[PDB]
Amino acid sequence: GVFRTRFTETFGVEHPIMQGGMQWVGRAEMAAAVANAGGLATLSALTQPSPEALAAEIARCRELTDRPFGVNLTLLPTQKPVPYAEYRAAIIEAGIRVVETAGNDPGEHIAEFRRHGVKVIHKCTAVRHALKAERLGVDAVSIDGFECAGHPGEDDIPGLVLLPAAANRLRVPIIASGGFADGRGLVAALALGADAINMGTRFLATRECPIHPAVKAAIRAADERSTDLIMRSLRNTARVARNAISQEVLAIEARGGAGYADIAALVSGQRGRQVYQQGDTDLGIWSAGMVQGLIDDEPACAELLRDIVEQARQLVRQRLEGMLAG
């Protein structure tokens, strides 16, 4: 493609751009659009309610794209127990060649994927977690900074510092994640030591993303200050779109004594998944990054990836080289 990096080489895709795990959203239509657009796409595993349904969704995604795509397997605190090993079995038996893991204690799942020729990208929120993942033999790490939609951990280190700190210590390829939307972010991430960018919020605002048009309009209208950090008091911080629910969750936490039971009904994924289906952005918790303040359009995935790498190339060849010319 336009940029050749350790990422494009390692994972065999045209652009140094990845669409990581997106609960509820990361379905066949999203993954295929990204894969057809030249990026590394992922189907969300836990968006499918059983291993058998994930097998069916992998098959459906293969009807929409001939290009390889990955699966994201997320290992975070769960309301109901999850049979991870069976999901893992389904991913392997389907011939998926790359997996993005995220969350706590990925060790046992990384090893099993390795034993079967499945490359692993592990997403994590601190240099010490990336190093531990590298010791476990992952093929790349995704470094999730404080900007990110979702779970940034509890250190509160933005990518401007976390990426070069990770690059000072890691040897496997690095994917920068959180806060990225355009070619300026891609060049910044490459300069800081990454080999690719991961994006979540930016793909919400694409034509093919299978969510309600009112969610996409909320992202365009939102600025960078319109997210909340919920569950800080439970040390399970999650960055979410500011709405009546997240503001209520914050009000409950500010009273003191709040435990997860006091907010479980507000933060439930079954309320949150209706946001994307019906477009009622106050129905529940939905994930959005502060990068929404850089987003006000709705391109097709193919034009978006092409625009990012072309804009990034022009930043190098015109803006940066122009400052070195005189």
Ligand X SMILES: Cc1cc2nc3c(=O)[nH]c(=O)nc-3n(C[C@H](O)[C@H](O)[C@H](O)COP(=O)(O)O)c2cc1C
Ligand Y SMILES: NC(=O)c1ccc[n+]([C@@H]2O[C@H](COP(=O)([O-])OP(=O)(O)OC[C@H]3O[C@@H](n4cnc5c(N)ncnc54)[C@H](O)[C@@H]3O)[C@@H](O)[C@H]2O)c1
- Per-residue contact track with ligand Y, 85 to 124, x per CB under 6 A? ----------------------------------------
12, 78, 164, 260: which one contacts its own copies (CB under 8 A)?
A: 164
304 binds its own copies (CB under 8 A): no
Kindly state the tokens that stand for 228. 């909340």
Q: Could you say which of ligand X, ligand Y, its own copies, none residue 234 binds, taking C-beta under 5 to 8 angstroms by partner kind? A: ligand Y
Q: Does residue 97 contact residue 139 with C-beta atoms inside 8 Å?
A: no
What's the longest Cα–Cα distance across the chain? 62
- Is 323 annotated in some ligand binding site? no
User: Which residue is closest to ligand X by CB?
Assistant: 200
Does 268 bind ligand Y (CB under 6 A)? Our answer is yes
Chain contacts with ligand X (rule: CB under 6 A)? 20-23, 25, 44, 72, 74, 102, 123, 144, 147-150, 177-180, 198-202, 204, 287-289, 291
Closer to ligand Y at the Cβ: 116 or 273?
273
74 is in an annotated binding site: yes
Q: End-to-end CA distance of the chain, in Å?
A: 30
Q: Are 53 and 44 in contact (CB under 8 A)?
A: no
21 is in an annotated binding site: yes
Which residues does residue 229 pair with via DSSP β-bridges, in sequence order?
Answer: 239
| Angstrom distance (rounded) from CA 75 to CA 184 | 31
Residue 307's CB is within 10 A of a number of other CB atoms, namely 14
Least Å from the CB of residue 261 to its own copies: 23
- Annotated binding residue 200: yes
Helix 51-64 and helix 84-93: axis angle, to 10°?
30
Among 56, 76, 131, 316, binds ligand Y (CB under 6 A): 76
The answer to whether residue 151 forms part of the interface with ligand Y (CB under 6 A) is yes
Q: Does 198 bind ligand Y (CB under 6 A)?
A: no
Identify the burial level of 325 via C-beta atoms within 10 angstroms of its C-beta, where 0-12 means exposed, 13-18 middle and 19 or more buried. Answer: exposed
Stretch that binds its own copies, among 73-81, 104-112, 189-197, 271-279 (CB under 8 A): 189-197
Does the footprint of its own copies cover residue 80 (CB under 8 A)? no
142 a known binding residue? no
How far is the C-alpha of 78 from the C-alpha of 9, rounded, in Å? 35
CB of 54 to ligand Y, least distance (A): 13
Instruction: Establish whether 179 is an annotated binding residue.
Output: yes
On whether the CB atoms of residues 289 and 148 are closer than 8 A, the answer is: yes
Query: 103 among the known binding-site residues?
Result: no
**Rounded CA separation 211/29 (Å):** 10
Name residue, tokens 């439930």: 268
Task: Please answer whether residues 13 and 50 qualify as being in contact, where contact means their C-beta atoms are separated by less than 8 angstroms.
Answer: no
Nearer to ligand Y by C-beta: 121 or 315? 121
Q: 36 or 101: whose CB is closer to ligand X? A: 101
Site for its own copies in 86-145 (CB under 8 A): 127, 145
Residue 268 binds: one of its own copies, ligand Y, ligand X, none (C-beta under 5 to 8 A by kind): ligand Y
* Sign of the torsion formed by the C-alpha atoms of 192, 297, 228 and 288: negative
C-alpha–C-alpha distance, residues 67 and 139, integer Å:
20
CA distance 281 to 27: 20
Q: What are phi and psi of 222, to 5 degrees?
A: -70, 145
Strands 227-230 and 238-241: antiparallel
Binding site for its own copies (CB under 8 A): 2-5, 127, 145-147, 155, 157-162, 164-165, 168, 178-182, 184-185, 187-193, 223-225, 290-291, 293-294, 313, 315-317, 319-321, 323-326
Residues lying near ligand Y in the complex (CB under 6 A) are found at 23, 46, 74, 76-79, 149-151, 234, 236, 238, 260, 267-269, 272, 287
Binding residues for FMN: 21-23, 74, 123, 149, 177-179, 200-201
